[PDB]
Swiss-Prot record:
ISGylated. S-nitrosylated; negatively regulates the ATPase activity and the activation of eNOS by HSP90AA1. It comes from Homo sapiens (Human). It is found in: Nucleus; Cytoplasm; Melanosome; Cell membrane. This is Heat shock protein HSP 90-alpha. Homodimer. Identified in NR3C1/GCR steroid receptor-chaperone complexes formed at least by NR3C1, HSP90AA1 and a variety of proteins containing TPR repeats such as FKBP4, FKBP5, PPID, PPP5C or STIP1. Forms a complex containing HSP90AA1, TSC1 and TSC2; TSC1 is required to recruit TCS2 to the complex. The closed form interacts (via the middle domain and TPR repeat-binding motif) with co-chaperone TSC1 (via C-terminus). Interacts with TOM34. Interacts with TERT; the interaction, together with PTGES3, is required for correct assembly and stabilization of the TERT holoenzyme complex. Molecular chaperone that promotes the maturation, structural maintenance and proper regulation of specific target proteins involved for instance in cell cycle control and signal transduction. Undergoes a functional cycle that is linked to its ATPase activity which is essential for its chaperone activity. This cycle probably induces conformational changes in the client proteins, thereby causing their activation. Interacts dynamically with various co-chaperones that modulate its substrate recognition, ATPase cycle and chaperone function. The chain holds residues 11 to 223 of 732 of the full protein.
Amino acid sequence: PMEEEEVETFAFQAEIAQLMSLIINTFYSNKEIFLRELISNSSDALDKIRYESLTDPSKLDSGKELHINLIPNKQDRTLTIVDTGIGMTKADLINNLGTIAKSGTKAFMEALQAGADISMIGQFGVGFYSAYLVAEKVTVITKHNDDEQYAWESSAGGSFTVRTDTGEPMGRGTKVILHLKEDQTEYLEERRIKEIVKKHSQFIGYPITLFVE
Ligand SMILES: COc1ccccc1-c1cc(Cl)nc(N)n1
């Protein structure tokens, strides 16, 4: 029996689209900072959870462990960033991922033309898009205590899809699945991943675990 699934196909806000192009169709060294940004988001997601969790310890029913996991798959050619953070509700997701303007967008783009490093990205509050320095496509699976599991995805081109995730359940948190461009497979090597965590992500306040096949 054929399953059926709803997808909503959104246009990224004009400037988030401009930024995504700029990221994709421009060469930047120091791409590795994409992980730093992704670990940061999770860190922030783990704080929101832990904080709220002292008001409602029942927000931990969905998983008490507060950590980050990195899964590089040499077969899929995916680098998966998993956290047991707070997750996003649909609206958090759509505000976080594309629809709503970001007060740092224009400024960051202006900055990049002036030759700023892609590393500056986080300060402009549009850090997640660095994901696209290395991935052709990016899949975010996410789960918020209040809501259901969502699967967001974009290969860029100006649009993203959001669909309720019928798929591996997570309980709580966000999973960023990076479908690495052909030439960015270095980010599936244990050594490289360990390198960029020690380098840019040392003071994260949660255990981070690297799983290697
Ligand atoms: C796609 O992830 C994000 C993008 C922008 C801002 C925040 C996030 C985010 C939110 C949560 Cl709850 N977890 C994670 N890992 N990222």
